[PDB]
Symmetry: C3
Subunit: 584 residues, 3 copies
Amino acid sequence: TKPTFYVCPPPTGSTIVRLEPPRTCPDYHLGKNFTEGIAVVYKENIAAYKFKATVYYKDVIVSTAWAGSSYTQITNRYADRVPIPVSEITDTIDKFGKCSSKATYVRNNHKVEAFNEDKNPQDMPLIASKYNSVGSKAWHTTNDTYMVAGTPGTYRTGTSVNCIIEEVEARSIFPYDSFGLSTGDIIYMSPFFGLRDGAYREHSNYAMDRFHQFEGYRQRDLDTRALLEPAARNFLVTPHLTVGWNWKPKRTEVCSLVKWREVEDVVRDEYAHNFRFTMKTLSTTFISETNEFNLNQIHLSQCVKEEARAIINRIYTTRYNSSHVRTGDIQTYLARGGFVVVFQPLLSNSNRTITTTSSVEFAMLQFTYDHIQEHVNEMLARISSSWCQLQNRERALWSGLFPINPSALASTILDQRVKARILGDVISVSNCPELGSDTRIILQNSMRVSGSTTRCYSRPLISIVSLNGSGTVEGQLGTDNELIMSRDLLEPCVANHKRYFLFGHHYVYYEDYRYVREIAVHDVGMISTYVDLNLTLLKDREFMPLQVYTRDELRDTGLLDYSEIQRRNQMHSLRFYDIDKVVQ
Amino acid sequence: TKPTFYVCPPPTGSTIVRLEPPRTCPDYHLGKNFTEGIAVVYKENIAAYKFKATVYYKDVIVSTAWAGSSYTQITNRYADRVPIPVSEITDTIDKFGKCSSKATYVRNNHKVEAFNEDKNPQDMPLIASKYNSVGSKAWHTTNDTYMVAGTPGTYRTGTSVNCIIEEVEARSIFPYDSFGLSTGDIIYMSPFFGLRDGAYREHSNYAMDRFHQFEGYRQRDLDTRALLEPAARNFLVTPHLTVGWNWKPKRTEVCSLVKWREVEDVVRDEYAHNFRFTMKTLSTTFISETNEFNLNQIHLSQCVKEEARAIINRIYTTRYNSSHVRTGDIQTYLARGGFVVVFQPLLSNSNRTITTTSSVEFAMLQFTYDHIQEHVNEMLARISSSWCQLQNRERALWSGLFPINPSALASTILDQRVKARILGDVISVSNCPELGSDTRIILQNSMRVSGSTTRCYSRPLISIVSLNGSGTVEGQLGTDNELIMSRDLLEPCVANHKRYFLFGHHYVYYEDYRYVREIAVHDVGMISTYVDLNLTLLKDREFMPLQVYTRDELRDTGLLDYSEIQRRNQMHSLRFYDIDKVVQ
Amino acid sequence: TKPTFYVCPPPTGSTIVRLEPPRTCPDYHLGKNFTEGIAVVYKENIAAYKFKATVYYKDVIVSTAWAGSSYTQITNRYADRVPIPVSEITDTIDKFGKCSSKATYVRNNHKVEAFNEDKNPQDMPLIASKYNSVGSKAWHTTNDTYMVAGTPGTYRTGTSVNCIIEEVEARSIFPYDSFGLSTGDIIYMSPFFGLRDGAYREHSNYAMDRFHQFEGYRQRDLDTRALLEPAARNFLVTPHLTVGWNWKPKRTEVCSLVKWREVEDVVRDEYAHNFRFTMKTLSTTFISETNEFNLNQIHLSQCVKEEARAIINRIYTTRYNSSHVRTGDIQTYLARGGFVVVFQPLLSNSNRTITTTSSVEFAMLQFTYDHIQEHVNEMLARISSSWCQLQNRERALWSGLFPINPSALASTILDQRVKARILGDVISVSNCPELGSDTRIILQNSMRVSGSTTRCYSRPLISIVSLNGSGTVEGQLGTDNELIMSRDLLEPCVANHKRYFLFGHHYVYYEDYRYVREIAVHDVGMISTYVDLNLTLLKDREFMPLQVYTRDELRDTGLLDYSEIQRRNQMHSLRFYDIDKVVQ
Ligand SMILES: *[C@@H]1O[C@H](CO)[C@@H](O[C@@H]2O[C@H](CO)[C@@H](O[C@H]3O[C@H](CO[C@H]4O[C@H](CO)[C@@H](O)[C@H](O[C@H]5O[C@H](CO)[C@@H](O)[C@H](O)[C@@H]5O)[C@@H]4O)[C@@H](O)[C@H](O[C@H]4O[C@H](CO)[C@@H](O)[C@H](O)[C@@H]4O)[C@@H]3O)[C@H](O)[C@H]2NC(C)=O)[C@H](O)[C@H]1NC(C)=O
Ligand SMILES: *[C@@H]1O[C@H](CO)[C@@H](O[C@@H]2O[C@H](CO)[C@@H](O[C@H]3O[C@H](CO[C@H]4O[C@H](CO)[C@@H](O)[C@H](O[C@H]5O[C@H](CO)[C@@H](O)[C@H](O)[C@@H]5O)[C@@H]4O)[C@@H](O)[C@H](O[C@H]4O[C@H](CO)[C@@H](O)[C@H](O)[C@@H]4O)[C@@H]3O)[C@H](O)[C@H]2NC(C)=O)[C@H](O)[C@H]1NC(C)=O
Ligand SMILES: *[C@@H]1O[C@H](CO)[C@@H](O[C@@H]2O[C@H](CO)[C@@H](O[C@H]3O[C@H](CO[C@H]4O[C@H](CO)[C@@H](O)[C@H](O[C@H]5O[C@H](CO)[C@@H](O)[C@H](O)[C@@H]5O)[C@@H]4O)[C@@H](O)[C@H](O[C@H]4O[C@H](CO)[C@@H](O)[C@H](O)[C@@H]4O)[C@@H]3O)[C@H](O)[C@H]2NC(C)=O)[C@H](O)[C@H]1NC(C)=O
Ligand SMILES: *[C@@H]1O[C@H](CO)[C@@H](O)[C@H](O)[C@H]1NC(C)=O
Ligand SMILES: *[C@@H]1O[C@H](CO)[C@@H](O)[C@H](O)[C@H]1NC(C)=O
Ligand SMILES: *[C@@H]1O[C@H](CO)[C@@H](O)[C@H](O)[C@H]1NC(C)=O
């Protein structure tokens, strides 16, 4: 509650200062050279190469029964899948639509045969299965299996043979040196093995005697009974069945890269030694290197070039036909995480394999961060430039207002109470030491000069009585609790005089140069020159490691688990038998 | 180092200007109409429907031995799994807990039988396996397998039959038209096939003679020897075993959608034709359309409605019991990426299938971007409003300070040195052309008027001597290196005169109207009116395509790989035999 | 188009106000105590434990042929895999590199034997398969299979036996109580079962008579014919083959945690009860708890401690050898989502199992949000501090300029036209009520005082004629369309008088105290004191649920699908046979 006053001795030319000329503000050259265009992004092809084939085999069952007193007993049953030799196929099924009843094959290196029901061989028609729905079709000749019992006390052996033609779906994966079938049989030969076009250099685990090729082969549709259209056709006689598939060259069917996404409007900027591809429709930003990608380092990449050319030409002709024009041939870049962006640059009218990560967020995060960063940097640059203009403008008010009141402005700028004079075009400042304790300042009642009536004081008079015995100073009350050491502020005595003066924590009121009243500072109504800026801060957040499906849930979508079946079924003999007891 | 001076000819009323009235600032109406409430998010169910069943079968082994000189030789061994007909089950096992020793079945379309050890049929008790741990239990009758040798030189055939009852776990996937068992057998009949409640319209690949239903069937627990509780029970006699499972209706057990996450506090805002669901506890924002979702377009969605009703009612009663109140029935929205949000709106007291993506991460990105965007937009709006108030306030200082010094303020505003006059309520400006070269300005030593002593000049006097022969102008030094063409700035000769004047790069010092000294501008102490704003920019970042597990690592978690086993084991005959040699 | 004037009655001391002292601005203490260091992040090990083993078995085929008239007929063929007893192995193959031609085994609890071709037993050399490429090698003795036909009308039975030694790859998963082989056989014994070191306490589903251990066993390489180096070796005789594998202790080979990523420069800050690990090279932020993690709660975690010690010591010695120094032993924290960060703190020179999520995004998002939040909060703090200094500085201009023009500044601050007086050190304001309608203000032509020539008016004179009959006021035009009710603003008649005054929407021009002309306000040239701030807002974005591979694509990378093979092949008997017809 104690007011602090100062005592400012008269200044001296010692400390002179000046206002700095207006500072220049940096011009922020934020903005890069970009390039609009069209892009097609390609990922690695992880799917298996899928085609359709046919299996031709005969089901040769050999049943041995023991005819008993009142029953028949099967004492053996040997089921076996045997191939159909290509001679019978190309000479009987695709000729008359019939299949011989006699199996001729090779087992244990011997040429063995077998006859259904031990009868004369016939040619039976191939009849569709009862479940021949779409896709999975099969034609067989016999619905019955033959066995005989005999007279009680003897063994009799029967035998069935069932000509079966099934359409299967084959499937081969890189490096395409084998393919498995829906029946479960692995065929250790590439689907592109042949005799011409350098195909004889494919992989094959079989001898060339098992392999037959029919150029111009006209396969037969067993439903419409009509020959199909000519097409080279491979036939391979596996020890347990015969596979046949339409031959197709390797160069035109499989390709390591597949189109992932077409992007109509991209923008390529160049940031510090690296390219950047911003795609605002996907909200995805890929970051490549400045070098081109040579598609000769990747196996089987012949599709992408022409595929992307057709797609990119269509996109340009359908969207940018009139606004822009092309500027050269397509460029190929390897984006980060294993992607391949085929980029066509537009202008306005003015060996290994690639492994792709399984994400797109490392890119969506990149786009979002780039957006916020670019925008916030632009806004900060604008704030900075605007701030400079405002300071350079306020320098004029400060420089133009010093003549009117130099001491107040110099005390504000230096954040310390000082007394300043204008010595022409410069300012001579001087520190005002604060009035210490042991000092009693008494306030006089009247502002009138003694005896004189046309002249009166301007500010209230005070008496700074000293306590250390240094006498008694008699001055008057300056401004902002500044105590001048003289009474040289007089004025012509105005009429209807009313003034308020700041005395510590009070506003003393003087009417006709005499004390009238006093009012606390906290009682006077307030006027604010302050403009408000209530800026709130971003709060801290914590992200939870959320998931839509767990690994268990993702390994729970199939009908059977191979490892489960094997763990449960491979202890059939341990569970239900005693493998440790010996019989003597 | 050369100072540049100007020469300002007297202005003319030609160019008059004025201060613009205060500009209005836009009121930013940033803020949307939101709606708090509770939500439950549902994903597609990708798991298989799992139940428990029992398999009843007999292991019929037929061994053929050749008794030799000093050894016995197995010349054949035919193992086979055969069904247990439902008559024996429902009449002997669930009646006395015993199983007949005689197998009666159908092979090759003939009714065949077989007897263990070729003896009289018995009824053996079903005994638990030695490995009957939790879950996987099995009861069998015989631990031994019977075979006989005979006299050296003859073949003898034995036969075992082992009654086996196993509890398996069945598993069926959409569209639920088959189910596989832990033993490996596919049962081509839906788990919900029956005779009542329209169940006879399910899928079945078998004839109705193989199917038996026992309404009110009381199954028997082979451990506590006690009947279980009544429940309709289906029995199906597959050619190789008999499956039995408790029947359950399709409408009450399987449902395409499963609850993923309950969210207690959500907020639905409406942004440009689309809904948005902000969930601050998950930090996830889903973006749907304005339309409701009809759950009748999705197969098997009967669970979600009532399930969500119970959960949502519990959540309200446990958290928002007193603060808010409900405002109508639940609404169903299809969020983006394939999710289903069942949203219950609160208020304060004042056919196909759905395919779900495997990542809500695009939604965590959405939430984070929405947060930064909303907050930064709010802060920019506040900066803009505050900026307007500050400019509208500084307009008062500029307008109020022009009378004191019009030329300085007009030179600052126009960013060009000009001379302005106040022609009443307007300002008449005039350009000040800069003083060119070939001009020598000489500085006079004394500021005193010749002869006069009570009158002296205010600013130093200069002599602008010309070189093109245009004579010699004699004026004095104005302010800011302005060269007035006259000497009309006089003053009453003050006592103790001290002034500093700016002469190019120097402050010339004059004491009693005579030159005294000079000081370089770079030597005078400085006072700064500048407030600092050191704003730093966001730097560029590069995100690496990081992963926790690769695709290989994710295909390395199982005990066996089916394709690996098949590639290695299906060349057993090629590796270890010579399939190309013929014997003659 | 109508100008609005005011009428301000003379103020009264009633409403006095004052400028607020400068407001203090909060010092933003944004900044946390961080700790630099090195970290190694460890994920859960999901891969199977993979080792190499050898299988020793004999292929015993038993063929029964029926020699016919002009052909041979196989009436049975029983293939079987039989073990090689360990006596023959350790006494003949690893001694001489030969294998006996006689199989001795146990089937149906009887000790059975069999001889290839029914000949005298021999010792045949083990010969490599023709396909012995890298890795998968196999040595067998016979490429041929023996069978005989006989005289037409009789059955003859042959038999092959083929000694086969294959190198397989075994594979066991947690809790390591079984392992499967590449041949498909499950071995129900832990790979770490033994006789010493407490290994006899592992899991084993077999009797101890089937198990043999050879301490110091020197296995034999069948290619270089040389003994290998000594190593304890387990042998187990499974009912269908014999497995042999080098024994290795459980404590030194398998460990639940695997090193995921080494991070050279991390920074651990402490935010609200939780630790945070910022890794700027990965752009990843993990958020743990303040507690240490006890690695004794996790099974098989013995690797991580010493592994991380070696790696962390190497990292320090290679990068931070001279800049920093260590500050204690390593600390172990469980980050969120199931990760384990082993953190070594640096200083400058001044039981269950852990389940890991499959993401590295919930943390890349965390890092990015932390970066934007920290930077934007720092910038907002700087804007706020700068704003305070600027307001505290502008308070000096407002306080210092009130003496010059109190009414204009008080009208601007209060955003309302008022009339203010300076009553010493305070300001007494008074509201100026606006001049209503029914009032005609007439403008006089001359500014000259009647008769007097050395004295003239300063502002144009007006006559406010009243219409309600209240007479006619005669005053003059004040400033800013303020209508003073008196004519007390006179001036010494200057020469060359030129003034512009604002009359509504016009600037009336007066030359020598007489009306001259008028100009519309919209016609006067403009000067702007306004500094521009064009701040643009962030626009709304929508993220699409993008994916690189779908779930189908990820389940399409294998050669065969087990469930597909089983669904297609398990209806072989239903498709191609008639299981519903009975023969009588
Ligand atoms: C061994 O026995 C089986 C039967 O156990 C024999 O199968 C028969 O042969 C038919 C020809 O292959 C086969 O397909 C037939 O039916 C197909 C389905 O069409 C429906 O409408 C039929 C009435 O016209 C109806 O009988 C039939 O119902 C049977 O099939 C359904 C299918 O799920 C079962 O649910 C039933 O239980 C029942 O078994 C169907 O509802 C039909 O598409 C077939 O037509 C073929 O040919 C057409 C040319 O005209 C062509 O246009 C069409 O696309 C098809 O390719 C065909 O009519 C049946 O399964 C069965 N036939 C009968 C009398 O039901 C099998 O042939 C035999 N094998 C040998 C070698 O002997
Ligand atoms: C063919 O031969 C096999 C043996 O080769 C027969 O199996 C026997 O029959 C028992 C009943 O099915 C079967 O289970 C028994 O043991 C179970 C384990 O309990 C433990 O504690 C026992 C102490 O009393 C101990 O002997 C036993 O150790 C045996 O089993 C473990 C299993 O890992 C082996 O590791 C050992 O080598 C040893 O063989 C166990 O440690 C036990 O749970 C069973 O109790 C059942 O019934 C209880 C009712 O009272 C019930 O409460 C409980 O829940 C169980 O359901 C039971 O005691 C054994 O494998 C074996 N018995 C013996 C004497 O070892 C098989 O029956 C036979 N098949 C036929 C048809 O002939
Ligand atoms: C049952 O019959 C099969 C044949 O049907 C017998 O297999 C023979 O035995 C050889 C030894 O195991 C086996 O491997 C031999 O060839 C390997 C490949 O090397 C190549 O270069 C050879 C030039 O000399 C060339 O002949 C050979 O071409 C054959 O094999 C390739 C393999 O794909 C086929 O594509 C061809 O069609 C052709 O069949 C190869 O191109 C070779 O690595 C082997 O050397 C081993 O031993 C070396 C020690 O000196 C060692 O350095 C090396 O690392 C190998 O371990 C070996 O020469 C062949 O498959 C075959 N031999 C012949 C004559 O082709 C099998 O032995 C028999 N089983 C029994 C028990 O009777
Ligand atoms: C700023 O705004 C927030 C939001 O309502 C408010 O809580 C806070 O009190 C405000 N601060 C000031 C100083 O007005
Ligand atoms: C702004 O702050 C940064 C951070 O320390 C500093 O490097 C830079 O020099 C500062 N700029 C100015 C102009 O002070
Ligand atoms: C602000 O800048 C944007 C960007 O070009 C522009 O469209 C807009 O008109 C500007 N606003 C103002 C008021 O100048």
